Amino acid sequence: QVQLVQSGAEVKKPGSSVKVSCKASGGTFKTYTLTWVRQAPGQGLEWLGGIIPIFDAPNYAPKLLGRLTITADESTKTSYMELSSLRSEDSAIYYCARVGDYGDWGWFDLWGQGTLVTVSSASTKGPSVFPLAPSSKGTAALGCLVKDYFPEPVTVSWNSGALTSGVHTFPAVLQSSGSLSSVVTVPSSSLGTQTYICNVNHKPSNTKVDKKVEPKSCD
């Protein structure tokens, strides 16, 4: 029943501000009981701010240095998180949540779905995909390299879905400016016979690059 719905993903330039919203659907609890938390890629949780029950206004993480504001609109059951002067470090998933004993069987535990906020002086860009040819020099390995892109969800399929066993698609990395790779394991014998093709279905840039991978030959 009771849900917390958060605002969509945001990309923001450094030094700017972002405002993420969180709307409570069901329930009849106070909006100011909502807490904000964040998780940078591959990192732990960090408590941003919220109202400790013994006080009347929100406390914030001191390392934020005052750049954070949390505001509750009771009219619309919406908590707003505003973070100004964005540093590279603020790039994370931001979570709204209601956790504690507030006065209804056990502790309340309710979480929003998360809101990815990405900060950088970069700008959007679609990716070109370069083949990783299987060596002619048992088990063969081949793949697709997906390089120099921005908008995050780059989905990868093999053989339009008809190939899934042995596939590894690696989590993306960020270079000093600006990549992903996907690989698959196959029997050497199928090379040349079975035609392997990877499908990058990059949904933001409208990129639909379907690259075929073959073994590389000589002269």
Binding site: T35, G44, L45, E46, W47, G49, G50, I52, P53, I54, F55, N59, Y60, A61, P62, Y95, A97, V99, G100, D101, W105, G106, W107, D109, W111, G112, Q113, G114, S128, F130, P131, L132, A133, S135, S136, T139, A141, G143, L145, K147, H168, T169, F170, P171, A172, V173, Q175, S179, L180, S181, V183, T185, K216, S217, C218
Partner: protein, 215 residues
């Protein structure tokens, strides 16, 4: 401030086994301590509050204990879903309500050596001005693995990026790609390109390599 320390950061346990996870507080939080579970792709889930109280709808195999400074989360018998990350959080009236750094529970399996592959840059990419060299370590366990890139026998540092898959659901192994990116001008200044893999399942480093321009 109040610092929570979760040691060890990775627990490697067999399916079915008892799991004990620790949390140490820099000063007494009495019993004002919470445990969360976080699975890949999801918001965290509250498991234990007030150090020892099970949250509603949390299965009975989870239990908390301790008070003051040292705290334990126990799972009496890990189910497949229990292999995830666990965080403690201090729940006093003193903000910030800090989390510990997290403890990952992973499947402990037998050592498995990596298969190593090296992919030279494509002719496609070289037309574009950059050379990417990909080194692949396929289906190994445990996760610790060192890949050292060598260009004409010279150790490459600050020059490549690694990336690791989550522990696989079928055989509990990991896979890893290391990518060396040189510009095309810099690529053509050298001949022998090699990645060197050390891992607990290898009695000796494995080296894969090619000479630039050869098939």
């Amino acid at each position: 401030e109040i610092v929570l320390t979760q040691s060890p950061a990775t627990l490697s346990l067999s399916p079915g086994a008892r799991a004990s996870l620790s949390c140490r507080a820099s000063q007494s939080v009495n019993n004002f301590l919470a445990w969360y579970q976080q699975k890949p792709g999801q918001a965290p889930r509250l498991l234990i509050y007030d150090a020892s109280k099970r949250a509603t709808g949390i299965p009975a195999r989870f239990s908390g204990s301790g008070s003051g400074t040292d705290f334990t989360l126990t799972i009496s018998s890990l189910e497949p879903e229990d292999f995830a990350v666990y965080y403690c959080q201090q729940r006093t009236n003193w903000p910030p309500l800090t989390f510990g750094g997290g403890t990952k529970v992973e499947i402990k399996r037998t050592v498995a050596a990596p298969s190593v592959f090296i992919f030279p840059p494509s002719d496609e990419q070289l037309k574009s001005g950059t050379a990417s060299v990909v080194c692949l370590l396929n289906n190994f366990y445990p996760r610790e693995a060192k890949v050292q890139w060598k260009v004409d026998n010279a150790l490459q540092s600050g020059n490549s990026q690694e990336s690791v898959t989550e522990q696989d659901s079928k055989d509990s192994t990991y896979s890893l790609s290391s990518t060396l990116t040189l510009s095309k001008a810099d690529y053509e200044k050298h001949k022998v390109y090699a990645c060197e893999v050390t891992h607990q399942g290898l009695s000796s480093p494995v080296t894969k390599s090619f000479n630039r321009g050869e098939c």
